[PDB]
Amino acid sequence: IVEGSDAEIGMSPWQVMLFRKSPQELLCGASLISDRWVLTAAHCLLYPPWDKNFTENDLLVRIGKHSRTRYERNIEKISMLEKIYIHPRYNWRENLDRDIALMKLKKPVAFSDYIHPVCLPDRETAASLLQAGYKGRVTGWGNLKEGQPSVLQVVNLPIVERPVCKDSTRIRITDNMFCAGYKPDEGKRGDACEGDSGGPFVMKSPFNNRWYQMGIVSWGEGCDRDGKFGFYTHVFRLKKWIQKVIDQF
C-alpha cells in the first residue's frame, strides 16, 4: 500500500496473510469470508510467467495478525490449507481476467475480536455501492513504494469510471475487473502495490452498517502513478463461481 495509513487494531479483522511455508515468506494478502474459507487472487497461487504454481501443502495462512515482527500469541492464528480452488477461466496469459481463488482451511478458525469474516456483496448491495466516486477501502502488507510496513496499511480510494480505467492502460480490461484511485486533479493519492494482491477492497453498507468486499487487489502498472489506477477483481461479478465451490457435493 502506497500512501496509506496504519490500521487501527481490529479495524480489518477479515484480513489474511498468505505465506510460503518453506521457507517462511509473505506472498500475498487474502480475506476471511467464513470460518473455513479464505478468498484471494488467483495469481497469488498460479502464475507461470513468474514460475509460480503452488499447492496447498506449500503454503499456510495467518489471521488476526497485527505485527509482522512480533507474535500476538493468543491473538493471531495460523491455519493450513486443505484445498486451493482457482477460477476455471482465470486468464494469466493476457489480462489476469478472473483473478480469483478460494482456499479451504484444514480446520475452522475461531472468530474473535481480532478475527471475523467480511460479507460478500448481494445483488442489490453491489448495484448500489458500485458507483464511480464512491470510496472503498484497500488494506495490505505489500510494498510501500514502486519498503515494507510493520503495521497493516490501509487506503480509502474512489471507484473510477470504466472508460477512464480503459483509457488509462493498454492492458485489455474486462467486466470482471474495476479500477479505483484518485485522478491527478483530485489532490490525494494512494494505491495498492506489489505484495497486496489478494487483499480486500471493501465498502461499508449504509443500509446495514456491515462491511462488504467488492474487489480483490489484482494488478496495476507501477504504483500510485498519476494517470494510472489500481485494478481489482470484481467480486460480485464472480459470485456464482464462489458459491459453486463453496456449496458443492
Partner: peptide
C-alpha cells in the same frame, strides 16, 4: 456473522476514516 467488527460496530464506534467512505456516498 460477517461485516461487523467487535471493537467497532459491535461497540457502536467508528474507526477514524470510515466517515470518509460514507461521505463519498454523499
Amino acid at each position: 456473522d460477517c461485516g461487523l467488527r467487535p471493537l467497532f460496530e459491535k461497540k457502536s464506534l467508528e474507526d477514524k476514516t470510515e466517515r470518509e467512505l460514507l461521505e463519498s456516498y454523499i
